[PDB]
Design a protein around this ligand. Structure first.
Ligand SMILES: [Zn+2]
Length: 346
């Protein structure tokens, strides 16, 4: 058997979990962190928001199994049992589980011992660069982990009161982007739609702090900074949109969307896809992933692993896309673990 080419037993409508695990397992800087035992010293047992280290520990133990090269498949019973204990709601939505896991891993590994209270602020007519750099510093004072290092970006939100002209600007972290789907469209069409001005309705109004009243304000999102690993959730369920979204395998250039003039390169290659077949409350999840060792694509359908061709990856079954920024790849020294390993080996 080859490390990472390891299927996962279905334990009874757990294909949503197996699909999310194959995407994270095939996120190189995340797996490397766990295979190099960098997590033990960062486990945060006392965190009121975390899972007593139990999600990080069980996930670490499963990844070590999957990348040992001893197994054609493993049964992720202990991990499924810890997920169920801390998140009883877990056929599910693969994106909700991913959302739970990115937050749970983060809080289990969070380097901040005691979170300080931050007086949240509007731009107040200040320049974007200063408000963005403030937001990011504030985020890191409460949130500092391997999950932040890999997955967290920053978006700008602009709310416009139709009474009083109040322009409310905030910078907010994200660890994934949920895109609205526009028969066939391009991923870049979906990103453009994500960053388009939309009116809020009677459902979910915005409170104007000038007017002291709820308004149907216009909300525009813009991307300030994009993470090393960008997780792109295609909003199919919100019964299910079967729209064919065409996405690139290589050289997704995001630079046209980034409003930060001093940003570095933002070219991404695909590393995994969560697929979904059938309809909302049922159907079946699988995954495509690029193995970090051989650079080839494989298809993971619970316990089964098979070679895939790049020609099969782009289908309407594509639900969550994992992209990695080229400048962060293993061998660049971008990640501290990569840099330490390179410096050790040279
Ligand atoms: Zn107002």
């Amino acid at each position: 058997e080859q490390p990472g080419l390891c299927g996962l037993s279905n334990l009874g409508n757990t294909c949503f979990m197996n699909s999310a695990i194959q995407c994270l397992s095939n996120t190189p800087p995340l797996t490397e962190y766990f295979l190099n035992d960098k997590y033990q010293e960062e486990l945060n047992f006392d965190n009121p928001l975390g899972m007593r280290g139990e999600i990080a520990k069980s996930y670490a133990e499963l990844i070590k199994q999957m990348w040992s090269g001893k197994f054609s498949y493993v049964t992720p019973r202990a991990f499924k049992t810890q997920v169920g204990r801390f998140a009883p709601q877990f056929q599910q939505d693969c994106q909700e589980l991913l959302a739970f896991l990115l937050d749970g891993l983060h809080e289990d590994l969070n380097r901040i011992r005691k979170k300080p209270y931050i007086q949240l602020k509007d731009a107040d007519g200040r320049p974007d660069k200063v408000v963005a750099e403030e937001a990011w510093e504030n985020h890191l004072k409460r949130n500092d982990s391997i999950i932040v290092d890999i997955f967290h970006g920053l978006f700008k939100s602009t709310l416009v009161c139709p009474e009083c002209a109040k322009i409310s600007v905030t910078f907010d972290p994200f660890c994934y982007l949920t895109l609205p789907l526009a028969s066939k469209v391009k991923l870049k069409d979906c990103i453009e739609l994500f960053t388009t001005k939309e009116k809020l309705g009677a459902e979910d109004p915005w409170y104007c702090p000038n007017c002291k009243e709820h308004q149907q304000a216009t909300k525009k999102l813009d991307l300030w900074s994009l993470p090393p690993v960008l997780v792109v959730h295609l909003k199919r369920f919100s019964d299910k949109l079967d729209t064919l979204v065409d996405f690139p395998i290589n050289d997704l250039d995001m630079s046209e969307f980034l409003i930060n003039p001093n940003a570095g390169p933002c070219r991404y290659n695909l590393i995994a896809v969560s697929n979904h077949y059938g309809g909302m409350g049922g159907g079946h999840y699988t995954a495509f992933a690029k193995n970090k060792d051989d650079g080839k694509w494989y298809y993971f359908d619970d316990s089964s692993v098979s070679t895939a061709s790049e020609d099969q990856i782009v289908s309407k079954a594509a639900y969550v896309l994992f992209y990695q920024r080229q400048d962060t790849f293993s061998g660049t020294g971008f990640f501290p673990l990569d840099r330490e390993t390179l410096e050790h080996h040279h």
